[PDB]
């Protein structure tokens, strides 16, 4: 094998892991700090909630009798009722959203570049599987060796492996669906597509056969205590 | 029934969604849905192939491209069929 310097472990192996871990935590906390809810006026939230009600009705109107459902239909999509017909209406926001989208990966690549400069010229760890020789130019940046086994990796790619393999740990400790990783706008068209979709939808009163499917088996009663 | 009490009677804008009058108003797509990814996948594949040295200088981009249009479709084959 290779008699690697022990001091490479205490200052190039562990610090990379610590930096990656706490930079991920920093990124997640900065992401939650930056997020601010955009101000919404009454009309937009009102129409969003209205289409929410329409979609949930389309989903589970089976538990509602037929006359109530077709009255819903009359109210939603019918000339005479009027609803769904008489219901319609470098920039800072683009720069802000582009910067927010950029800040999810670019800080990782900048940290990688800084690590590649700072820790250039080492052999940090041996990747325990035989990587291909054609992968040499990116795993072993800063090394002039030629016959060195491809399984030996410099600092930058070791940090990259660390940042790829630590997202699951982030989900483990930080919380479910954390933001530390590496990876309606228009209502008129929404109104029209809801119109067409709920026109295409049908009715099936799920209570037409509940009694017969209930009469078949006795009612569970144990555990009353 | 000796205790059949009736509690209805007087009914008093109207609540939203209410309407008093009782109105009496009342292969194939799968082929296109499957051919969608079958035609969109080569586009990303063609872009990645035409990248050339750019793709070689971008090891992560190739993996993302091969996992976006392909791989994911194979992984979500059951989901694609169910959709």
């Amino acid at each position: 094998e290779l008699l690697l310097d022990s001091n490479i472990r205490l200052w190039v192996v562990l610090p990379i892991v610590i930096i990656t871990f706490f930079v991920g935590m920093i990124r997640h906390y900065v992401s939650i700090l930056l997020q601010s809810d955009k101000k919404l006026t009454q009309e937009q939230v009102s129409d969003s909630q209205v289409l929410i009600r329409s979609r949930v009705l389309r989903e589970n109107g089976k538990y509602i009798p037929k006359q109530s459902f077709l009255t819903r239909k009359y109210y939603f999509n019918n000339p005479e009722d009027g609803f769904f017909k008489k219901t319609k209406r470098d920039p800072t926001m683009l720069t802000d959203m582009m910067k927010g989208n950029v800040t999810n990966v670019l800080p990782m690549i900048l940290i990688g570049g800084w690590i590649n400069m700072t820790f250039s010229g080492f052999v940090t760890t041996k990747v325990p599987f035989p990587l291909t020789l054609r992968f040499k130019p990116m795993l072993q940046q800063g090394i002039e060796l030629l016959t060195l086994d491809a399984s030996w990796v410099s600092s930058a790619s070791w940090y990259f492996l660390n940042v790829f393999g630590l997202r699951s740990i982030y989900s483990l400790i930080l919380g479910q669906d954390n933001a530390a990783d590496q990876s309606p706008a228009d209502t008129n068209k929404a109104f029209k597509t809801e119109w067409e979709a709920l026109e295409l939808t049908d009715h099936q009163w799920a209570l037409d056969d509940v009694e017969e499917e209930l009469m078949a088996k006795d009612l569970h009663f144990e555990g009353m205590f | 029934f000796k205790w059949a009490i009736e509690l209805s009677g007087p009914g008093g804008l109207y609540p939203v969604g209410y309407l008093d009058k009782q109105v009496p108003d009342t292969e194939k797509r799968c082929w296109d849905i499957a051919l969608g990814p079958l035609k969109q996948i080569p586009m990303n594949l063609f872009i990645m192939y035409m990248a050339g040295n750019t793709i070689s200088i971008f090891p992560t981009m190739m993996v993302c491209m091969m996992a976006w249009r392909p791989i994911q479709a194979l992984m979500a084959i059951s989901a694609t069929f169910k959709m």
Binding site: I109, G112, G113, S183 | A51, F58
Partner: peptide, 16 residues
């Protein structure tokens, strides 16, 4: 950094 540029060009590609 040549490495930073060569790894941020895919980032622009990843966004697009």
């Amino acid at each position: 950094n040549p490495m930073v540029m060569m790894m941020v060009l895919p980032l622009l590609i990843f966004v697009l």
